Symmetry: C3
Subunit: 144 residues, 3 copies
Amino acid sequence: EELQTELYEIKHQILQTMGVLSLQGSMLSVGDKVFSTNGQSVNFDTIKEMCTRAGGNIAVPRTPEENEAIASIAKKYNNAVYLGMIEDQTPGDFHYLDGASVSYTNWYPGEPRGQGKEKCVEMYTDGTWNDRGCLQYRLAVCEF
Amino acid sequence: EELQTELYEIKHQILQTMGVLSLQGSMLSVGDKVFSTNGQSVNFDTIKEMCTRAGGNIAVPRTPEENEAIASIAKKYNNAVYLGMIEDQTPGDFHYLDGASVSYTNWYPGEPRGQGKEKCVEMYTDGTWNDRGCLQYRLAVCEF
Amino acid sequence: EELQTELYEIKHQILQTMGVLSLQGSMLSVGDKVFSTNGQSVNFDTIKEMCTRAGGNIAVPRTPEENEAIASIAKKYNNAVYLGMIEDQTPGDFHYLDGASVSYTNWYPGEPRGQGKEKCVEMYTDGTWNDRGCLQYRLAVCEF
Ligand SMILES: [Ca+2]
Ligand SMILES: [Ca+2]
Ligand SMILES: [Ca+2]
């Protein structure tokens, strides 16, 4: 049947485009998630908008492998990265932007300790996390 | 059935690739149209060939939103853009390259006024149009 | 039926992404093969890994048209390119990395003449081939 070989060509072409983007370092693929940056360092609200404009979301690692991918991008551009999570009303508790409680974490030892005054989360270039105010300039990393 | 979740993965991956290209400013998507440039400034015939070689066509805006997208690219590269239209045998009348009469227009006030000696159309960096000879160096913008 | 117009949109979007990558010189498409480089010059083993990490393979031309595409990339970056082939146990005989005997060739006159001491193959910037040791720094070109 012509349908499946049409699917074959389509799948092949998608893999070619993703292959080119990967080879050139334009993105990193981890499982079903693709991470990318525009190289800009801006505040949390600005990153959120940049990602959504491109049809994605501000990146958030939910597994060690995802964490290491974002860390490698932070390291490449030598700047910390704002992540897609924010502090609950209760200090020390963080949620994803959809409202769910954060599960996987990788806090730098002692963090989070902003006492409710640091509602955002940055990833240091070693991949560990720190709660931080949301107005700093951080590398914009999106997930798709 | 395995067919639709296969379609789901395919759709997701296409959105990832488009998301990366968009985030990095490699293209602009407006409805079903994608605009992109190679950053080169060359004449009308040269642009036509560059676009067709890449499987697209020299850009032409048919809506205000498309017009503003091309204008933003003109503004980014600080150069006017040749558009995909050319003057009819009768001065003042323009057609798309497929032969159809141009519908949406955004002429700079007083334009077109080349009296038949300016068969091409350039978009100024403010998005308005001017009829112009076809031999100038203009930013190559393609639509796909 | 909704399936085929869904396929239409998918095909269109793939062509847009490939069009953007092509227009910007990020890849070259020849038939069903896509060639791309990361611009790096490294040894044979390093190229192999870079290509496989991106989901492709070190490039190998099997037709004159494929050969000319890789040559154009060699010429663009002004460096010779390691190809996806290696010498058999018997000097002068080369195979693709899957083990099959090489068919199409484009040896520089007199080549291969490494007497079994040059197990890799480089493409000179004019597109002709030379057997060479595998430890030189050559442009990494992948096929997808
Ligand atoms: Ca803190
Ligand atoms: Ca004029
Ligand atoms: Ca030799």
